[PDB]
Ligand binder design. Structure first.
Ligand SMILES: COC(=O)c1cccc(-c2cc3c(=O)[nH]ccc3o2)c1
Ligand SMILES: COC(=O)c1cccc(-c2cc3c(=O)[nH]ccc3o2)c1
Ligand SMILES: COC(=O)c1cccc(-c2cc3c(=O)[nH]ccc3o2)c1
Ligand SMILES: COC(=O)c1cccc(-c2cc3c(=O)[nH]ccc3o2)c1
Lengths: 114, 114, 121, 119
């Protein structure tokens, strides 16, 4: 299922546990940073994926970028499991610079290094 | 300044605690309407007028209903006399592969303390 | 009343647009932010026969940030809808992509939202 | 410039664009089969003097989903960059906004990504 170690298309490492209560917990390496999120613990049974999302704030004991990324996507099971996401990366800014505070992109995760 | 009750422009209620370790925990009401949220924030933001970066996720399942979807909010907290949390969001639904192209909505929410 | 006219966003930009009978948007955009000076060409499209159920009118346009004065090597697209009324408004969300190397492409695109009114805020 | 010609996305859509000398993009966006009911006008803009340091060429375009046969009351904008070479690509992200009432405006806009090739 969702629990496991995943890799995006650029080589980041996403180590996640999907708990019984809908919780996502784990670490993200782009050293390691804390992540938390949520997932649908009772998905549909019609072939649809499992909706999920998580957040990393880019502060650890070694660096602070004053920013945070959220990933929103779905887990698609099968022979080659995948998590397909789109993400928003917001930096702390002054009000005058807030218009350019948020980057957007898309990450796809598999259980194999790219 | 983050811990407490927040209200968006469309009548939703965001009840959050900002923990010392960078955790966001709480509930989102958009009892049957209340959902768990979890996320992260920068616990050591700059002191130069910049906002505090943060994000959180709600999966739209509770003990009463399940939309098979999840929203992530990415944004910044801005303190002061009229404090705000300014966000952009992504809402992904679980879909089949054929319908995945239309799986994700995007928008923006502004939260106030009053 | 209608899309054709001069509009202003919340940050002081000026959007001068003509909505043609064939669905064409043409005009000029002047930005108060970024690596920008004076007017830039815009082109886009709008729904020339919107629904009659109270819905807004879908539209979109593009500015490439090159003119006779500067070139930021970037382009913004706005996607949104015109909402008529006593306080006419165009509500948009936008994507701003810069030309980058492949190694930097992951951070090539900014996202935001602009609301336009015919009265300058 | 390398942009003028026919491009194909990952899901069976096609467009034929002309990149004009002063930055104009004009053409048609259609389906793989290309029947008239699936063809729509596209207009946009591109950077006609891109950097020479290996960076891509920024561009964008819009299609409103109305033609002489149907009208979805919606419009898509694609924002991205052209990357030249033997395996040329246009890499984009897109926003698809539908006309809605104010009560439904919160769910008016889909977001996604498209990659186009010449093959
Ligand atoms: C201001 O600081 C930043 O912008 C920053 C810092 C550290 C890591 C990241 C990072 C990693 C990553 C990823 O793997 N997928 C999508 C987005 C993303 O963003 C961003
Ligand atoms: C497809 O959407 C759903 O299935 C669904 C179900 C329940 C609630 C929501 C909801 C509430 C909310 C909000 O307050 N801000 C931003 C997004 C957002 O989405 C979405
Ligand atoms: C990376 O940014 C640039 O290269 C750049 C250059 C010139 C203008 C802009 C600009 C103006 C504007 C606006 O009014 N609304 C939404 C977006 C937006 O972007 C961006
Ligand atoms: C015949 O086609 C239609 O009736 C129609 C209606 C609404 C949207 C779209 C459409 C196509 C498309 C694409 O290729 N990339 C990103 C978005 C996108 O949207 C097509």
């Amino acid at each position: 299922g969702i629990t496991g170690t995943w890799y995006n298309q650029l080589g980041s490492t996403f180590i996640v546990t999907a708990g019984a209560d809908g919780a996502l917990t784990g670490t993200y390496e782009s050293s390691r940073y804390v992540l938390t999120g949520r997932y649908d613990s009772a998905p549909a049974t019609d072939g649809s994926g499992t909706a999920l999302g998580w957040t990393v704030a880019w502060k650890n004991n070694y660096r602070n970028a004053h920013s945070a990324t959220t990933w929103s996507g779905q887990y698609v099971g099968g022979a080659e499991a995948r998590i397909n996401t789109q993400w928003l990366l917001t930096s702390g800014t002054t009000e005058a610079n807030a218009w350019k505070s948020t980057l957007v992109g898309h990450d796809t995760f598999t259980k194999v290094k790219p």
